[PDB]
């Protein structure tokens, strides 16, 4: 039999995988049973393991879901928010030292998340069941007399 | 003669390869001013 990779690893095949292995990382993977084509990125697939967006981050190779930069604490009062300079990294950078701002990320957001499954049917009706023994028939009346 | 006995299942499946921990910490502290 075959085993769905579970979450945060992909198969390495499109069909006939061999071994699942951890997603890179920069990628998250989200899903369970993510598989790698070879067309495109080599780490990514339909459901397999994404890079993580723009401002969230994630460091640890398999995993579910990246993280928020976490609000920079220099001190008394100093809640300085951080953001990411290119599209999948593991560390977070203060968001006002950035050289390439919020302004010139020209990539377009991918699209939402297509629908679930349906539940699986009830158990199907048994087949009828089968009709007694059949009555017997009459009897043979004793010999009439001579 | 009845029919004989079924199967026992297999057990419960590896669990998958546990992740490494995270980087160093930092490179640099603060490198001297001019
Ligand atoms: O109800 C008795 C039933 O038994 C069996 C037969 O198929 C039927 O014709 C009927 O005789
Ligand atoms: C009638 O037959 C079915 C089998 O489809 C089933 O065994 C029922 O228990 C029986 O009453
Ligand atoms: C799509 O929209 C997000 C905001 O959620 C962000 O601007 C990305 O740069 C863009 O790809
Ligand atoms: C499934 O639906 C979403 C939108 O809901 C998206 O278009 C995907 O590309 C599609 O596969
Ligand atoms: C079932 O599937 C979709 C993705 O196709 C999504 O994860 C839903 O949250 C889930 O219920
Ligand atoms: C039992 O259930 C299945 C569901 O797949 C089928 O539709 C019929 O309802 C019956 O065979
Ligand atoms: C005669 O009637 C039926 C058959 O015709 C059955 O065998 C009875 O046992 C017998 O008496
Ligand atoms: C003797 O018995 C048989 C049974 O069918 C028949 O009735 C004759 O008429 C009787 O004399
Ligand atoms: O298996 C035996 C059968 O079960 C039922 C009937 O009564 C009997 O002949």
Not at chain 1, 2 to 10: N, R
Not at chain 2, 8 to 14: I, R
């Given at each position: 039999?075959?085993?769905?990779?579970?979450?945060?690893?992909?198969?390495?095949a499109p069909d006939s995988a061999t071994s699942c292995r951890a997603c890179?990382?920069?990628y998250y993977g989200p899903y369970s049973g993510a598989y790698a084509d070879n067309l495109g990125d080599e780490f990514e697939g339909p459901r397999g393991c994404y890079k993580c967006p723009y401002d969230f981050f994630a460091d640890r190779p398999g995993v579910r879901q990246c993280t928020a930069c976490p609000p920079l604490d220099l001190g008394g009062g100093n809640l300085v928010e951080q953001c990411t300079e290119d599209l999948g990294s593991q560390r977070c950078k203060p968001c006002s030292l950035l050289s390439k701002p919020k302004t010139a990320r020209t990539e377009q957001s991918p699209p939402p998340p297509s629908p679930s499954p349906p539940p699986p049917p009830?158990?199907?009706?048994?087949?009828?069941?089968?009709?007694?023994?059949?009555?017997?028939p009459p009897s043979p009346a004793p010999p009439s007399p001579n | 003669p009845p029919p004989p006995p079924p199967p026992?299942?297999?057990?419960?499946?590896?669990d998958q390869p546990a992740a490494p921990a995270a980087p160093a910490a930092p490179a640099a502290p603060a490198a001297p001013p001019p």
């Open positions: 039999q075959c085993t769905p990779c579970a979450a945060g690893f992909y198969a390495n890179p990382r920069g009830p158990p199907s009706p048994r087949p009828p069941s089968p009709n007694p023994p059949s009555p017997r | 026992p299942p297999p057990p419960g499946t590896p």
